[model samples]
Target: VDELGFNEAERQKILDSNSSLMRNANEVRDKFIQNYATSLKDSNDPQDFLRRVQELRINMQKNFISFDAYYNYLNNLVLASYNRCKQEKTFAESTIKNELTLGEFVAEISDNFNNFTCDEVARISDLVASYLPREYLPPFIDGNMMGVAFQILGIDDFGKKLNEIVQDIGTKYIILSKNK
Candidate 1:
C-alpha cells in the first residue's frame, strides 16, 4: 500500500471503462463468431485452420520476450518459402490484409535496432532499394538497410551518413510534394 495504490477515482474510472468495453466487446465478438460459423461449412480442415489462426495470434503476442528467439527461425523459413514461389515475375498476391498503425509498424521492425543510434530509419530503406531481394521485401525496409549500411561502412560512418541522408530526404520530399 505504500508505493502502489489506486485511489477511488482511478478505481472508478477503471471500472467504468471496463464495463463499457465489455458491453461493446460482446457485440463485436458476436458478429465475428457469426461470420466464422456461417463460413465454416465449406472448409475441409476447419480445425487446422482454427488452430493456425490461434497460433498466429499467440505467437505474435509472444513475439517480444518468448517469441524473439524463434523470430530469426520463422523469418528464415518464410524467406525461403518466398524463394520457392514459382512465378515468372508473377509473384503471389494476398487477399487478406492487416493494417498496422505507423507507430505499430515502426515498433515491430525497430526491435532489433535498439543498440544503434537511430531516430528516423527511413533513409536506410531508400539507400538499399536495389540491394534487397524482391522476394524478401518488407513494408518497412529501414531495419534491413541499417545492416547493409553498417556492413559496407562502419558504425560511426553509418550513423553520420544515415543522419545526413535522412535530413536531406526530409527536406527534399516536403518541397517536392508541394511543387507537384
Candidate 2:
C-alpha cells in the first residue's frame, strides 16, 4: 500500500477522513455509554450487550490514530467511566459484586485529576487538538468540550449539580432512578 505512490492530496484526504471518523466514533461511544447505563438501569440485557460491542469498536478505532490521539482517547474513556459511575452510584454500590462500582470509578477519576496535573484533561485536549492538522482540530475540540462538560463537571458535582446538568442535557444521558 505504501508503494502505491499516493500524492500529498490523497494522503491528506485520507487523514482528514480518518479524523472525522474518529470524532464520529467518539460521539457514538459516548452515546453508547449513556445508553449502557440506562440499559443496566432498566435491566435490558440486549441493549447493554450492544453498548459493550460499540465500546469495543471505539477502542479499535483508537488504535489507528497517533500516540497523542490514543492518549487523548484514553482520557476520554476515563471521563466516560466517571460519568457512568456518577449516574449509577446506588445500583453499582448495592448490586455489583466487585468493588468496581460507581464509587470506585469516581475515585479513579479523582486520582487521574490529581496525578495527571501536568497532563490534565484540558491540556490533553489542547495537545491532541494541536497535533492534528489545522482543519482536523475542531472536531477534536468539540469532543473535548463535550467530554469535559459531561464527565468532569457532572461527576464532580453528583447531587444537585449533576441532576441539573442531566436535566439540561436530556434524559438519554441520565439515569434518574437506579434503585427501584
Candidate 3:
C-alpha cells in the first residue's frame, strides 16, 4: 500500500539480512577485544602497547561497516577495560577515556557530523537519524545502516555524505513544491 508496493516478503528478507549483519558485527568486535587483551598481555614495553593499539585501530577502520559496528566496538572496548584492565586504578580516569560511555561515544561522533546535518530542519527520515545529538536517537537508525553498501565508505566520511543526501532531498522537495 506504500510507494512501491514493497510486500512482506521483501521486508522479511531485509530483516533477515540485517540480523546476520548484526551477528557478524558483534563477532568482529569481540575478536578485536580479545586481540586487545592479548596484546596488552604480550607487551613488554609501553611502545609495544601503543603500537598494538594503533594496529587495532587500523584493523577496526578496515572492518567497521556501520555505525553499530563502530558503536559496538567502542562499547565493548569500555566494558573490557572495566573487566579486563588491571591498571585501571590510574589509567581509566582520562577525559577521553570517560567518553567511552554510550552517551559520550555517540556525542563525539555526532558532533563531528552535526554541522552539516543540522543545516536547519532534520530532514533525513525522522525515524532514522533526524535528531541533533545522536545519543538519544533510537536503535532503529543503526538497524537501517547495517548493510553492504554502507561498509564501502566505512564510518569516517559516511555522516557527511548522508547529510549531503538529506540536503539534496530537501532541495528537491523545495523545488518541486514551489511550482508556480
- Among these predictions, the greatest lDDT belongs to 2
TM-score of 1: 0.20
Model 2 regions more than 4 Å off: 1-82, 96-106, 109-120, 123-125, 128-180
Checking candidate 1 for backbone clashes, the offending pairs are: none
Cα lDDT tens digits for candidate 2, 1-180:
221122244334433533432465445434544543332223234434334334433543454423334444444433443353344444445555665444454344334333332233344344333322233122224444434332322222232332343333233223322232
Tens digits of lDDT, candidate 1, 1-180: 111112234334433533432334334434433433333223245344344334433432443212122222223322222222212011111221333332232332222122111221432333322222233223343554435433432333444644554454444333322210
Query: Candidate 1, residue 118: CA error in Å?
Result: 33
TM-score for each predicted model, relative to the true structure: 0.20, 0.20, 0.27
Q: Per-prediction RMSD in angstroms?
A: 24.6, 22.5, 22.4
Residue-level error in angstroms, candidate 2, position 76: 9.3
What stretches of model 3 exceed 4 Å from their correct place? 1-10, 17-23, 37-53, 61-154, 162-180
Task: Report the C-alpha displacement of residue 123, candidate 1, in angstroms.
Answer: 40
Q: Write the number of the candidate with greater TM-score, choosing between 1 and 3.
A: 3
Count the clashes in each prediction: 0, 0, 0
Residue 105 local lDDT, model 1: 29
Name the lDDT value of residue 95 in candidate 3. 28
